[PDB]
Amino acid sequence: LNAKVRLLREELQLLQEQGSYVGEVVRAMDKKKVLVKVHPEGKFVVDVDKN
């Protein structure tokens, strides 16, 4: 119960963090970069997180 309450108390400031775009991967390339189509915008050559 205490964990539930604590999570619901920090969730207010956890919910103001910016979302993340959802894109479609075209093909991996280069050192560690990727080519992604972020609809409705154009494509990007983005990095990849270490994980």
């Binding site: 080519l35 915008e41 154009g42 494509k43 990007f44 050559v45 983005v46 990095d47």
Partner: protein
């Protein structure tokens, strides 16, 4: 690799040995110098961290634009995905030999400077048109052409195989070849054989594919077919069944005839016009050559004109053997009896005879083809004659 242009006599000569020995000596000097300097200090760390500075300069979220115009002063107009266009600076680490209008460039996120170019798909029309290795077969299958094979080789193969012979005499190779003959003699067969035996991008188009349904698309198709023929190094463009697009060009016609004429004019210009044609060789086949345009088959357009005659007496035996090679036969086959008749038989007719004989043997369940089977198949094949007996004779 951007090496010196020898431009010595260009024929095996002592001057060309000396210029070449000099290049080898200089290259040996460079190799020794680089090896010794690498041993003294790797310089790998120095080579690295320049890439790190470059990656710092080009931010993480590189955007893909579309180059529109180069102002020729390390500046450009680049269009973003939304449609907006920006006047930016082409930075120094981008290989400018790749930049051309319409290319997919990589743009900086904040400053939109050009910081790279992306590779592009490889099928404008190449995958559709190119034939790869001809599935039919190599030169072995073709039987009884011989002289025609030699002419085709002297036209398309020899220039790529031994060009010194031409460069010595100073003559450029003959421009193009047109293969003409009655239906079923081996024009397409020879074209496919040279396609599979050659080392150049071979493109095949049937004239009926140039009769498009929308205005200007036939001309656009020919323009693009020759456009992706200089982009692919040595190439051979084989326009089979030219008779569909080329014709006497009678002015008094209406309908799609005008559009076909315009397509033919565009093809004429591509074959020989204001611009140099680069290194592209053209082959054309036509059952009916008498109806073509003199402008289309004038000497400077098509130099060589090869005639394909119907097999007479021994070419017939050769085709029969070639097409019955992979087929078990009973020891009673009178192939000579089959061919002896002067029935104007064509090679396609022989192939049909063999295939139908095999098919009817299969139908009867037998394990071997018989002479009677071959005779009945030949009779069935020759049943497709038609026409009127007394008429014309």
């Amino acid at each position: 690799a951007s090496k010196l242009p020898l431009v010595t006599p260009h024929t095996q000569c002592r001057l060309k040995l000396l210029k070449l020995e000099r290049i080898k000596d200089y290259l040996l000097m460079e190799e020794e110098f680089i090896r010794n300097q690498e041993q003294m200090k790797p310089l790998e760390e120095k080579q690295e961290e320049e890439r790190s500075k470059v990656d710092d300069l080009r931010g993480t979220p590189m955007s893909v634009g579309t180059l529109e115009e180069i102002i020729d002063d390390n500046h450009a107009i680049v269009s973003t995905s939304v449609g907006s266009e920006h006047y930016v600076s082409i930075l120094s680490f981008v290989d400018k030999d790749l930049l051309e209008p319409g290319c997919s460039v990589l743009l900086n996120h904040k400053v939109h400077a050009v910081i790279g170019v992306l590779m592009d798909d490889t099928d404008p029309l190449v995958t559709v048109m190119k034939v790869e290795k001809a599935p039919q077969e190599t030169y072995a299958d073709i039987g009884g052409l011989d002289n025609q094979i030699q002419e085709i080789k002297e036209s398309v193969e020899l220039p790529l195989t031994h060009p010194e012979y031409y460069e010595e005499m100073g003559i450029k190779p003959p421009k193009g070849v047109i293969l003409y003959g009655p239906p079923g003699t081996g024009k397409t067969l020879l074209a496919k054989a040279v396609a599979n035996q050659t080392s150049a991008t071979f493109l095949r188009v049937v004239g009926s594919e140039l009769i498009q349904k929308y205005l200007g698309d036939g001309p656009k198709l020919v323009r693009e077919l020759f456009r992706v023929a200089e982009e692919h190094a040595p190439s051979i463009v084989f326009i089979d069944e030219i008779d569909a697009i080329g014709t006497k060009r009678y002015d008094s016609n209406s309908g799609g005839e005008r559009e076909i004429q315009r397509t033919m004019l565009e093809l004429l210009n591509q074959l020989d016009g204001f611009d140099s044609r680069g290194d592209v060789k053209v082959i054309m086949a036509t059952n009916r050559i008498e109806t073509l345009d003199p402008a289309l088959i004038r000497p400077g357009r098509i130099d060589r004109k090869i005639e394909f005659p119907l097999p007479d007496e021994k070419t017939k035996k050769r085709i029969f053997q070639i097409h019955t090679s992979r087929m078990t036969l009973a020891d009673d086959v009178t192939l000579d009896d089959l061919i002896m008749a002067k029935d104007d038989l064509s090679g396609a007719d022989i192939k049909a005879i063999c295939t139908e004989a095999g098919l009817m043997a299969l139908r009867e369940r037998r394990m071997k083809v018989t002479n009677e089977d071959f005779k009945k198949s030949k009779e069935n094949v020759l049943y497709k004659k038609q026409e009127g007996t007394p008429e014309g004779l």
